[PDB]
Amino acid sequence: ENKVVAPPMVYIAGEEMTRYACDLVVKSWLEPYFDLSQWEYFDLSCVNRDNTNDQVLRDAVTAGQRIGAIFKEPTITPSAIQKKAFGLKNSLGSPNGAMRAGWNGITISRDTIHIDGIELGYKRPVFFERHAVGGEYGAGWSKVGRGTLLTTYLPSDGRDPFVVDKRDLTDQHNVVVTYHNPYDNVEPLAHLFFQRCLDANITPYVVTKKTVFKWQEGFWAVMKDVFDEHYKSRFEEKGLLQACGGDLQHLISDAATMQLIRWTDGGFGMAAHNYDGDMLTDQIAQVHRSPGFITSNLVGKAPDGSLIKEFEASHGTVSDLWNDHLAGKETSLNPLGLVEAIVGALQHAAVLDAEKNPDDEHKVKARDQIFNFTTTLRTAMHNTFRYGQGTRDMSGPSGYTTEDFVRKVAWRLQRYLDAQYDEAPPPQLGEPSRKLRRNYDIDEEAINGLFQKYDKNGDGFIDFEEFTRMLVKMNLAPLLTK
Amino acid sequence: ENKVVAPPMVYIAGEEMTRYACDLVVKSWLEPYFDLSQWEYFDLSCVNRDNTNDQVLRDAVTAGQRIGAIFKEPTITPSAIQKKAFGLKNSLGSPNGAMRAGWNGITISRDTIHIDGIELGYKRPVFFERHAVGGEYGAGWSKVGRGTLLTTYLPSDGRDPFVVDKRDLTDQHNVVVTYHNPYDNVEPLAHLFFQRCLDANITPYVVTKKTVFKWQEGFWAVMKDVFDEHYKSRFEEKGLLQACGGDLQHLISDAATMQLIRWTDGGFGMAAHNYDGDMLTDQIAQVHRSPGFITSNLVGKAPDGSLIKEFEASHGTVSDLWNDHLAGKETSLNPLGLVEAIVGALQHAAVLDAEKNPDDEHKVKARDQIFNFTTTLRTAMHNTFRYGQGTRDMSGPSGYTTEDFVRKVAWRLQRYLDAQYDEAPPPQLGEPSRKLRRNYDIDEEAINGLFQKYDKNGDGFIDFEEFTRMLVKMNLAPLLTK
């Protein structure tokens, strides 16, 4: 064994089907080739989080700032039923607040693609930057009765306390809501967003409700300033500002969610506030395929100012497939998002190892080894899917189980690492019918109803005319240029 | 000479094409049969609002409290350019805050229908209660720097000032936002909403994001408590809780916005917060022709306890047709929404007259006179549309001008009031192709792209399969139950 020593990396584990499948993937695709040992595991199981009163969470955050590259598994934010069943003494919420605080912010939700010949919802990649902090999700509130509410601001600027808002609550049933948006890291965000769009040949956009909530116009201002100063020239010089008329376009929240579903050939990126970005990314996810086919990557700033990158899949622990496994029924979990997050974490760990130790040879070379490996591992997994041996949500009921999918990808991976151009090339495909998706069984009787509805002619005479009627009746016909 | 005396009613006038067209409708359809004179006009033109520094709006509010029945025309909330041209020296905003304060609240957005046989988007009436007060639209905010923000609540319950939220703002560019919801009049709202859904055989629903925004859970509670206590029995007696499973259903606002577009059969009602209600009623408007086909009716409480009702169309002053009118080019403005508002205001004025003066004979029958009149007035307007002599956005290019339509409806109204059944009945119609809508021209080659290409299967040859997939790929196929 002369295996490569993987760079230091934080590894946060959860429970259930995703813990089982990540364990399977690391053992089959990584330990064959890597000395881990510099990985720093943390058990964020519900039970382990509760016994340590979340000291394992404070240790994961600490390890993350010091190391700066972290893969995290899906975790259970236990519901009351689940909190009782597990019997956790002192309920603890989502670890997200801890991580996003300890590491600074922004949350990249970009579509996953099988660049070797499986079409998905979007023909070309989509990027999305969901501002990691601020907004309604972090609001403080209280139900209050009669009186007056007073919002003061106390500057460290030495100046006098500021009356932000004062109001006279006449009712005996009120709710009051207060929150903030921190906007410093909007200019880092812009640089991350615009630059990654440059590299990818993506037309970028900014999405807000700034016309209606004027407190949001700061966001768009910084995005605009940074853009005009540093990237507009390079964007036109690549001819990407073309489908948006020469400048960075602002989209109001509610025209954004339409070009999402419309410009279905992809090749666009969007940046937005935390709440809006959550909603819009769920929407992009559904257009592309399912939630597991979207990235969920925190990018933040370490105290020293280096990049902290944390990677996640966009699904939970998948309890029902866990129960199927416990009762000996076969399961078929798509590991795509999980694998993508693991190789992102590993890649950034290698990058940080070289950046933290320049003037070290076998670290700028370890990085290049890592990137070549993750490239041929992607090939092994995409080709497996293309040979019809993907999991059952993509390859249909003849698709492999979780375990034989992992094993078959390891088989191709050991071969691909030694030339091995046997088999033959797998085929180009096309969207596996979305009905293969888990927990998506439609309503064939309803959709009968609606196609016969738009008839009034014969055996569904569409002949475009009905299509046009449909799309206007739908309120989805593209408007004109004007 | 013997015309009926209209009950007292406030009339708020605006500017431009709707002021001219309302003046014409009142002169042609009402003045023939009614002595107005007890109508109390207020000029809320931009110029008169700015010269009086909105004392005209404040007097209108006072008169509306005294009379309680108000028609208001669209008014201009002037844009900077428009404020320049008009030369208004102290900008004054929307009259909405004043009216909703002076009269209490909730904003009714219900679909308008041509009960004599022209189908539109929804087929059966849809009701919507948008909570008139509270929420994000009435927020205080500020740009703040480094420091600490402090939200105090000072009860008149005499107890100690309450720390709603305190937070430690580290950034140098922050925005802070605070707002409230008054929830007393939710139970008035419930009674208003549930009872009218009863009268109309509408299944009611409540829409919130209470699951993600816990402070909204009050809304669902009050609405539910009233329902279960005061209306559930009557709704099941009518078998209206059938498609919603026996009880009052709460919908998260993003499944609401799905059944909106889905249940195109109508026959449902929704109540929501001020902000969500704004967005969802814009969407209901779109499913059903255009925004001008949705009412906008304030309902509030006067000091005496009588209902205060203000009615508006859901469009503006229609500036572009005003430009055309001043240049002597003909215009064709659909007065449907404005008329629906005028006869609603007139009905409520008659109702208030009777309720405020019982032991008065010719007021309880003046009420019935008004209602008979408005019914034959609806028949005349609907029928004119069905004879193809409506305005051109409904009747295509052979439709009449604003002025010819008003004259033709006046002719039919005069004849109908004299038991004159000549002519011959107009036909049943069907949605006038929405391309006839003003300022709505489709990008037919884009929609080519989508039909000619996207659902291939040869030369057109769409039956199901591509329809079903189409609904799947856009994420608009109806799924499974829970």
Author numbering:
A (entry chain D), B (entry chain C): 5 to 486
The study reports:
Isocitrate dehydrogenase (IDH) plays a critical role in the tricarboxylic acid (TCA) cycle and catalyzes the oxidative decarboxylation of isocitrate to generate CO2 and α-ketoglutarate (α-KG) with divalent metal ions (Mg2+ or Mn2+) while reducing NAD(P)+ to NAD(P)H. In accordance with the preference of coenzyme, IDHs are divided into two forms: NAD+-dependent IDH (EC 1.1.1.41, NAD-IDH) and NADP+-dependent IDH (EC 1.1.1.42, NADP-IDH). In the present study, we investigated the overexpression, purification, and detailed biochemical characteristics of a type II homodimeric NAD-IDH from P. tricornutum (PtIDH1). To our knowledge, PtIDH1 is the first eukaryotic homodimeric NAD-IDH structure proposed in the type II subfamily, and it exhibits a unique EF-hand domain at the C-terminal.
The monomer of PtIDH1 mainly consists of three distinct domains: a large domain, a small domain, and a clasp domain. In addition, a unique EF-hand domain is observed at the C-terminal domain of Gln424-Lys486, which is composed of a helix‒loop‒helix conformation. As with all structured homodimeric IDHs, there are two clefts on each side of the structure, which are formed by the large and small domains of one subunit and the small domain of the adjacent domain. The putative active sites are located in these two cleft regions. Additionally, PtIDH1 contained two insertions (Ala84-Gly91 and Ser323-Ala331) in the large domain, specifically forming two α-helices (α4 and α11) at the active site. Therefore, the dimerization was formed through the unique C-terminal EF-hand domain in PtIDH1.
